[PDB]
Design a protein around this ligand. Structure first.
Ligand code: KPW
Ligand code: ZN
Length: 257
């Protein structure tokens, strides 16, 4: 029922999900001059060497690559986090043109897209339980700008024609998400929420400063996806991003000087 258009988009979500107007909603604008360096923050530990990807799928709001999270394989630790967070899935948000598509913004700058690597805190045992906790999930956010191709993304781009419509999925084994990471792990961090329903306030956000570059041909392939299922009127899956929400009583901390 919810989506991104005029009659069911982000400004409507609060009716079904009143937490949409809550105290720690995401995304936010990152004001780089106000974010303070926090020398107590650790380097992030992104340990993806043993990741086991399973499927790629169109869920009618994005496309997502899913991982086996039944043991500590691909894990995020350190940074602002206490304990161990297992990688469950990644997905993207993107625009209809290169000047929009990201959910977080940086001094009001919108990037062409944003990658979300979604991890959950193993102390809660399963992801369903984790989403009910204020420290249940950690989402690693990575901006995409349009320039040179990202070789590590091409394997994803090349299967999107097989999952054009909502409900479609495909085998997507042996995908290495290390190929989506920028050089620097410099980051901003703040407490927030899921950016799609149910908008649960369960996320420690870790947003990398350095964007990755993707080619115009790569992002064009994202824009050929459909929100609709096969047999319904074709409506391009574009502009599947929630706008920046009020920061309220939160501080965004920088890992870097
Ligand atoms: C895959 C899986 C396995 C087992 C349980 C669940 C699950 N169940 N339920 C939920 C979830 C659930 C779990 C994990 N992530 C989400 N959603 C999610 C994740 C990341 C982002 S983003 N854009 O900020 O990165 C936005 C939404 C939802 C939500 C619910 C409480 C209504 C019920 N999901
Ligand atoms: Zn997301």
């Amino acid at each position: 029922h919810w989506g991104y258009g005029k009659h069911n988009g982000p400004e409507h979500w609060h009716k079904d999900f009143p937490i949409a107007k809550g105290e720690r909603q995401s995304p936010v604008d990152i004001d780089t001059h106000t974010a303070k360096y926090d020398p107590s923050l650790k380097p992030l530990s992104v340990s993806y060497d043993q990741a086991t990807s399973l499927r790629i799928l169109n869920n009618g709001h994005s496309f997502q690559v899913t991982f086996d999270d039944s043991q500590d394989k691909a894990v995020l630790k350190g940074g602002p986090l206490d304990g161990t967070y297992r990688l469950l899935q990644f997905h993207f948000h993107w625009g209809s043109l290169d000047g929009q598509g990201s959910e977080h913004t940086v001094d009001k700058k919108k990037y062409a897209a944003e990658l979300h690597l979604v991890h959950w805190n193993t102390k809660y045992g399963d992801v369903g339980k984790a989403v009910q906790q204020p420290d249940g999930l950690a989402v690693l956010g990575i901006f995409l700008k349009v320039g040179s191709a990202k070789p590590g993304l091409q394997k994803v781009v090349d299967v999107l024609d097989s999952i054009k419509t909502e409900g479609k999925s495909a085998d997507f084994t042996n995908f290495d998400p290390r190929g989506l990471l920028p050089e620097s792990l410099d980051y901003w961090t703040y407490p927030g929420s899921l950016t799609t329903p149910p908008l649960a306030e369960c996320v420690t956000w870790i947003v990398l400063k350095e964007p990755i570059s993707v080619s115009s041909e790569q992002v064009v392939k994202f824009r050929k996806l459909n929100f609709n299922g096969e047999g319904e009127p074709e409506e391009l899956m574009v502009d599947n991003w929630r706008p920046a929400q009020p920061l309220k009583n939160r501080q965004i901390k920088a890992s870097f000087k």
